[PDB]
Nucleic acid binder design. Structure first.
Ligand SMILES: [Zn+2]
Length: 627
RNA sequence: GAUGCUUACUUAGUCAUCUGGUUGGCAAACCUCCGCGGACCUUCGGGACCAAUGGAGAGGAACCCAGCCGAGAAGCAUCGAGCCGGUAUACCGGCUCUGACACCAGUGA
């Protein structure tokens, strides 16, 4: 499909004042960078704002601007492979011609199709909203170098925030349509039309689901429970009766459609972009760490010279090995961390497919939760048919568990489990493999130690803010405490990621089988609820999946993240699926367990390692216990 | 290795009983109300977001900035542990000499 996994691997080094310029002139130079970072993050946010009205509406006939929308985001598909200048330069010309920032009208190039050339004329012949009129008036004075990097980020912003999140939703909606029907005929008990009637009943009392389930599955006894714990919802049930035979089934109908991807513009507050300085717009010295960042208005080769953190000696891509293509300036808090964009190539894997193909299967081809079993069959079959030799005897495979106490990675080659030797994922003065009152390091109790301070310190902010203008926590409320937790929580995902990758480089593994856990929460997580800010201290098991998959493709490997099973209540020798939920929990505390009748006496990590490798093959099937 | 000095430096990669502790704030930065105007989603109740070569106000709890102390970064100096060479057992010269880790910033709870 698309080449999502790029071979860039950008390294970010924080900025310092030069060793002998000043401590105050550095503030007056970063302010010159923040002012230019404010404009770039706002120019991008305006270009993506003007062009978004040309998007397909998913249910309307193809507008003439649709075939230009697909070229703005992905110019590579709509250009010949022998493009003269760049796939990023034709994107600018189409965006230039769509606006009034080019009076030359040089769009008539052989590489531009007539379907596209005649479509931009249908885009320029459109009234602007009096903000794009001044926007492209500002962008008209910009040099072509700025506009090239300006349309690129804006196009890559919608393509990454809306288009991929929307394309993953259309198929999620098309399969929801089939799933909706396949639920109606298969469950025709008391919802031929009553489900619509229940929607009207739910409309009169805006509830917009544990409480709803209790109200629906109630025989007038739940009224006492509702009073103890709601009161308004009881009226709807009484009105419906004037009931329980269809209430328990109408709730599972999920009348609400899957939510559309809410588009957000690049925000300087919470989630921003990084400003790119293209070719001839920066100078980097790596012997002595100084960076020549150049602003937009600098005439002929003057640069603001800063100092950055020294390039690590243990860093694997050395600056002399690969050339730096661009510098990505972003502002975390107030300190301007810049990032270096270089080219580090990938290695050919032992597969004729790509990781992006595996992305396509789960994201859009098999998006639904009940459609997970078919995803594994297609994902497994795709890898085997693209495998050069017999994949049933020489497909090296790893399956990690990624726990907090410990994690073990089983080694599979031909469905024959070799050895689940563990991972040393704990961060103390030395890399241990297990935890020897709060545990010092990357333990759950240490992360929650900031949260209890974060909760205590947030009780003095709302109290003081109430006396100022009133008489919960903004993105800036805990600028230093939260970012440190961010650099700490993601580091636990960075350590786990490389430990997997370093483990997968010792033995020539071709496939990593991760699970689909959401993550683990520190002890101080269930008390700071109702706040988006608490999301920073969530261990984010998906973040490890982010980094493991990104690195595995770099080293020439594929990652398959199976849907979340129990994976630890599943035995490894037999398919028992222990449902005790008490002996397993008690045994998991001490790190071991035992199968009820199978007799396997492995640990929770090795068994999880063995199961996940077995789940990839046809030996173990998913629970699928919805009915 | 231990010790000392200096630095328009760092203390917002993390861990190592660790966003170090503490004192305040002209400028400024940060911040609270409005939005010239746009714009995503929507149960049409709103949610969420960008935003003027633009309007005021205000808190140092928070953010921001600055000072001090502790701490480590480097540049240099002294001695010790270990390696080698020649000259006449010593000396000079050179080297390993200073923690670990990490660095790409589908659905749903
Ligand atoms: Zn068993």
């Amino acid at each position: 499909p698309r080449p999502r996994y790029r071979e860039e691997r950008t390294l970010v080094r924080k900025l310092l004042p030069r060793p002998g310029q000043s401590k105050q002139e550095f503030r007056e130079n970063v302010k010159k960078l923040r002012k230019a970072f404010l404009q770039f993050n706002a120019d991008v946010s305006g270009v993506c704002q003007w062009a978004i009205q040309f998007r397909p509406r998913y249910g309307k006939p193809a507008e003439p601007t649709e075939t230009f929308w697909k070229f703005f985001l992905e110019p590579e598909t709509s250009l010949p492979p022998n493009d003269s200048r760049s796939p990023e330069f034709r994107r600018l010309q189409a965006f230039e011609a769509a606006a009034g920032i080019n009076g030359a009208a040089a769009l008539d190039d052989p590489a531009f199709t007539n379907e596209l050339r005649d479509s931009i004329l249908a885009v320029a012949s459109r009234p602007k909203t009096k903000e794009a009129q001044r926007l492209f008036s500002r962008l008209k004075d910009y040099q072509p170098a700025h506009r090239m990097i300006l349309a690129k980020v804006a196009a890559e912003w919608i393509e990454s925030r809306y288009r991929r999140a929307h394309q993953n939703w259309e198929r999620n909606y098309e399969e929801w349509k089939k799933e909706k029907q396949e639920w109606e005929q298969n469950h025709p008990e008391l919802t031929p039309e009553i489900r619509e009637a229940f929607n009207q009943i739910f409309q009169q009392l805006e509830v917009k689901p544990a409480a709803r389930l209790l109200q629906n599955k109630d025989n007038c006894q739940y009224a006492g429970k509702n009073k103890h714990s709601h009161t308004a919802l009881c009226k709807q049930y009484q009105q419906q009766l004037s009931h329980d035979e269809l209430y328990r089934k109408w709730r599972r109908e999920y009348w609400r459609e899957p939510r559309k991807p809410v588009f957000r513009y690049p925000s300087v507050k919470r989630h921003s972009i990084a400003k790119i300085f293209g070719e001839n717009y920066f100078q980097a010295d790596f012997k002595n760490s100084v960076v020549g960042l150049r602003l937009d208005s600098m005439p002929a080769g003057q640069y603001l010279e800063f100092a950055f953190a020294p390039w690590p000696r243990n860093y694997r891509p050395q600056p002399g090995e690969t050339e730096i293509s661009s510098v990505h300036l972003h502002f975390v808090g107030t300190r301007p961390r810049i990032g270096f964009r270089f080219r580090v190539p990938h290695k050919r894997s032992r597969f004729d497919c790509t990781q992006e193909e595996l992305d396509e299967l789960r994201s859009r081809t098999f998006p639904r939760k009940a459609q997970d079993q078919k995803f594994l069959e297609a994902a497994r079959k795709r890898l085997l048919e693209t495998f050069p030799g017999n994949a049933e005897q020489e497909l090296r495979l790893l399956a990690v568990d990624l726990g907090t106490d410990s994690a073990r990675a089983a080694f599979f080659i031909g469905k024959t489990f070799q050895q689940a030797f563990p991972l040393k994922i704990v961060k103390i003065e030395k890399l241990y493999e297990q935890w020897p009152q709060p545990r010092p390091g990357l333990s759950r109790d240490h992360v929650g130690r900031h949260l209890q301070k974060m909760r205590a310190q947030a009780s003095e902010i709302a109290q003081k803010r109430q006396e100022l203008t009133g008489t919960t926590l903004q993105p800036f409320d805990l600028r230093g405490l939260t970012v440190h937790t961010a650099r700490m929580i993601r580091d636990w995902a960075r350590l786990n990621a490389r430990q997997i990758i370093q483990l997968a480089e010792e033995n020539q593994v071709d496939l990593i089988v991760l699970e689909s856990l959401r993550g683990f929460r520190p002890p101080g997580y269930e008390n700071l609820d109702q706040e988006k800010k608490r999301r920073v201290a969530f261990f984010a098991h998906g973040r490890i999946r982010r980094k493991v998959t990104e690195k595995a493709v770099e080293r020439g490997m594929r990652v398959v993240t199976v849907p979340y099973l129990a994976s630890s209540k599943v035995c490894a020798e037999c398919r028992k699926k222990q449902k005790d939920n008490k002996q397993w929990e008690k045994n998991k505390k001490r790190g071991l367990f035992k199968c009820e009748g199978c007799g396997s006496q492995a640990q929770v990590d090795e068994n999880a390692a063995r199961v996940l490798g077995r789940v990839f093959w046809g030996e173990i099937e998913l629970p699928t216990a919805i009915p």
